[PDB]
Amino acid sequence: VNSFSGYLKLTDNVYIKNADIVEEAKKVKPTVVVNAANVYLKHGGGVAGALNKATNNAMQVESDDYIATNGPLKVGGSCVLSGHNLAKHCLHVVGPNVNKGEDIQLLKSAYENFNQHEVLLAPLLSAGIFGADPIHSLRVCVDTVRTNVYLAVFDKNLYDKLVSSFLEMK
Ligand SMILES: N#C[C@@]1(c2ccc3c(N)ncnn23)O[C@H](CO)[C@@H](O)[C@H]1O
């Protein structure tokens, strides 16, 4: 379990790889894969769509059932559900959607959920269709998470920008 390779070490607990999080999950079968979710766990596109498609919609069926019960998540919150064929657990984490003016302060709350798990395979939160500054999201991740997070960034342009920015932060 958790046999990650090819990651660049940024800090003592944050690693980054240019890779598809679904392919990483299939190769490693991590204890926890993080989903970049919305409050209804509607896994339409991006990371959520990729993860759900890999489960042939089992993640969505499970998610629809959770929401039908406990109601939607809060922005900045999370829930632990099955990892299906990708991982033992999936931590669905809701970062703020700044395309909707959701408070960017909730990005720190979002990353704080990672601290409930020893080791996570995760995407960068609130970027892509959530619209947040991805350098900012990396900075909040590095500043906030206390446990071991392995970040999988599919987009090579974004990956190179993130790594170049991290080298210039310190
Ligand atoms: N890069 C990237 C993305 C993304 C989309 C789809 C995937 C995937 N399959 N694996 C990893 N990353 N990934 O992750 C961030 C999620 O907030 C945004 O920048 C997205 O554009």
Side-chain angles (χ1 to χ4, degrees):
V1 199
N2 299 314
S3 50
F4 300 101
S5 75
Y7 286 75
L8 182 70
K9 180 174 187 187
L10 301 180
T11 66
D12 302 329
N13 61 307
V14 176
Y15 304 75
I16 192 167
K17 193 179 178 176
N18 176 214
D20 177 359
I21 191 170
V22 174
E23 288 305 308
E24 290 293 301
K26 295 175 181 295
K27 295 165 182 183
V28 163
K29 304 191 122 50
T31 298
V32 178
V33 61
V34 172
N35 179 25
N38 55 57
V39 294
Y40 303 109
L41 301 184
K42 287 297 187 183
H43 312 304
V47 169
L51 289 174
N52 182 50
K53 275 164 41 192
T55 76
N56 295 305
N57 216 45
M59 176 178 282
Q60 191 65 68
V61 177
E62 182 199 25
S63 293
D64 289 343
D65 183 71
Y66 173 93
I67 296 294
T69 303
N70 316 95
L73 283 61
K74 302 182 185 65
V75 178
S78 74
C79 63
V80 182
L81 290 172
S82 177
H84 298 269
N85 55 312
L86 302 181
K88 187 176 185 162
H89 307 289
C90 181
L91 182 73
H92 298 269
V93 176
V94 182
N97 188 338
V98 302
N99 289 322
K100 302 145 60 85
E102 300 186 340
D103 184 12
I104 186 62
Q105 172 65 50
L106 298 171
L107 185 54
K108 179 176 166 58
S109 302
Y111 275 114
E112 285 171 358
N113 298 285
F114 289 24
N115 294 340
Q116 272 61 73
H117 305 278
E118 289 270 350
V119 180
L120 311 95
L121 170 63
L124 201 66
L125 299 177
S126 285
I129 63 184
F130 282 61
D133 185 281
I135 305 306
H136 176 47
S137 178
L138 178 61
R139 224 162 42 242
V140 176
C141 179
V142 168
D143 287 339
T144 300
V145 305
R146 301 180 217 276
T147 54
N148 294 313
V149 53
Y150 290 80
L151 296 169
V153 177
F154 182 84
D155 194 298
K156 185 48 140 94
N157 285 344
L158 177 56
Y159 172 88
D160 291 337
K161 161 162 169 171
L162 291 168
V163 168
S164 181
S165 295
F166 182 81
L167 300 177
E168 301 183 335
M169 289 170 203
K170 43 157 179 173

